Amino acid sequence: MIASVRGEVLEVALDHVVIEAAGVGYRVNATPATLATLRQGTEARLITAMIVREDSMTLYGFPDGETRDLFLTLLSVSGVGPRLAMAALAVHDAPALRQVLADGNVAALTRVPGIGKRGAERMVLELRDKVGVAVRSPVVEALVGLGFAAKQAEEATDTVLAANHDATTSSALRSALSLLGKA
Template sequence: MIASVSGEVIDIALDHTVIEAAGVGYKVMATPATLATLKRGAETRLITAMIVREDSQTLYGFADTEARDLFLTLLGVSGVGPKIALATLAVYDAPALCRALADGDVTALTRVPGIGKRGAERMVLELRDKIPAAPGGGGAAVAGAGAIRGPVVEALVGLGFAARQAEEACDKVLANHPEASTSSALRAALSMLGKTK
């Protein structure tokens, strides 16, 4: 199993990055929030989980071991594959997901693309006792607009957009949606920039 990949970021896309290590380019699937922390040409290290299927071998990358372990725990739920597990971590950070599971918040879990009411109920049932409750109360953790702007602009520049163009799109998104998470702000900015091309 490949537990981590360290090397130069040679490509960043919407759902993955390519990291060159020892002359080999590893395609690593990741959440928008994780991808937003990367910069093309910079050295990085991602904690990974390798999922081997009959017809594929896929690496999933995470900023820390907590997120990777949560991803692997989500895979233990019947009906949850790697794509849904990664989508769950794209919508909720680890503490917010732990809170939703501990509180049995089915409505919050159905916000994840690919998870319906029955899937969310199954997730709560199977994971409620396996996942520690997150410290502190409240709902999903949402970073302030200032903390979100930098990573989103950096991710857009890494994807090939001009810095000024990236800043303007990010500012418009955050002005309209100040409560947006990094991943939702990045998606909205990409959507906006896609319409202007």
């Protein structure tokens, strides 16, 4: 629910920061890297990921949305929870971590405390082609997200994009839907 928190940095710890928004101070966990860029008494905005469990409600912040998204993705792998996800990133910056996950670098992953030889392999297997392996593609992802079949979702997207090129990613989606909604 909480996608971001912007406010006065009240405290910069070694594994988190406290940002005050409208008098409310939110604790947001982060990596040294993300923290290093923060200074007490200054304003700051972090892109967060709110993770609610039965006995907890936690925020994890990052510099950008690309990174925050990467975190959420790490979470989708079996046996990889919030903490381990953060550790992976604390040990390997987003850019590297991604790289490793493409180069199937199992040696590198292992270094992250908590990731065994197998664990690393499951991570590499689960997301090598889900990190980085543009009008068109985005629109079909949107349609597949709404539950449409791929080789049909892309059929609408080509018709739309071809019938109208100047189309933005959003308008393109609206169009595809109108054709899929079968007028």
